[PDB]
Amino acid sequence: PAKIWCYCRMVYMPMSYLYGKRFVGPITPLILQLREELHTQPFHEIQWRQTRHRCAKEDLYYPHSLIQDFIWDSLYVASEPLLTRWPLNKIREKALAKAMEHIHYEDENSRYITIGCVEKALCMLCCWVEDPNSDYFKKHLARIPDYLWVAEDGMKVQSFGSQLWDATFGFQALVASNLTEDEVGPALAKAYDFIKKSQVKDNPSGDFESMHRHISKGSWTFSDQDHGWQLSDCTAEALKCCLLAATMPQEVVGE
């Protein structure tokens, strides 16, 4: 796990837990009346072992390799006959406990504003199926309205914040443009103090080192300081903005 990308590691881990637990949601009367119209054949009177490899020709960009397909096919008969009727209690329970503790340690350091709407939505189910009555679930439910957005069309969902990146770009554009009226000074200061306050300085809570994470020291995020994720792209623009504002007079922009 210390080799794969961070996004894949944080997305597939709840998927791994859900697959291990084999959790299925309750079959409401809507589900039974809607599952028939979707499939072209009867719901329960079809096969599933040979239906696993059927890729559409419209949504196919990177086809699977022969080795990957062979590995998946071998794993299907290696795991399902074994860890479903005679599951290894020790191994499976340790894996589930490690996944749960890793998710709990990750969300606390991320202030429950974890990367990705899909990842947060899946983590909410992952923590709800473990304890429907807790405080982590309630706090996850509380940050849900932080992603909805409205536009000319109906309500949409914002994948992640981008205020810092656009603010830095706008500040750079304003300082590069000639100060004709010179009245942009108050706005420049009122943005510069926010930029200074947006710097992430504290280390992640707990043993962030040796936990499949990288050291963060005076780093910048892409969305906001409440996330605490290092990203070299935004830091490079922030440093340029700070250096360009450094040569500006103190009496006009402030400290």
Task: Name the residues annotated as catalytic.
Answer: 233
**Residue placing its CB nearer to ligand BOG in the complex, 75 or 88:** 88
| SS3 assignment, position 243 | helix
**Is 71 near ligand BOG (CB under 6 A)?**
no
Contact 217, 203 (CB under 8 A): yes
| Closest distance of CB 81 from ligand BOG, Å | 11
| Closest distance of CB 87 from ligand BOG, Å | 5
**Residue placing its CB nearer to ligand BOG in the complex, 75 or 141:** 75
Position among 33, 40, 89, 247 found at the interface with ligand BOG (CB under 6 A): 89
**Residue placing its CB nearer to its own copies in the complex, 73 or 93:** 73
**Residue placing its CB nearer to its own copies in the complex, 52 or 190:** 52
Q: Alpha helix (H) ranges present in the chain?
A: 6-21, 29-38, 66-79, 89-109, 117-130, 136-142, 163-176, 185-197, 232-246, 250-253
> Which one, of 161, 163, 180, 181, lies nearest residue 171 by Cα?
163
| Closest distance of CB 86 from ligand BOG, Å | 4
Separation between Cα atoms, residue 114 and residue 161, nearest integer Å: 11
Select from its own copies, ligand BOG, none the partner in contact with residue 217, using the beta carbon and a kind-dependent cut-off of 5 to 8 Å.
Answer: none
| Closest distance of CB 152 from ligand BOG, Å | 57
Contact 14, 122 (CB under 8 A): yes
Question: What is the full DSSP assignment across 27-55?
Answer: --HHHHHHHHHHSSS-SSSS--SSSS---
* Positions in 66-85 near its own copies (CB under 8 A): 77, 80-82, 85
CB atoms within 10 A of CB 16: 14
Select from ligand BOG, its own copies, none the partner in contact with residue 87, using the beta carbon and a kind-dependent cut-off of 5 to 8 Å.
Answer: ligand BOG
> Which one, of 176, 111, 97, lies nearest residue 140 by Cα?
111
Give the binding site for its own copies (CB under 8 A).
Answer: 44-45, 49, 77, 80-82, 85-86
Give the binding site for ligand BOG (CB under 6 A).
Answer: 86-89
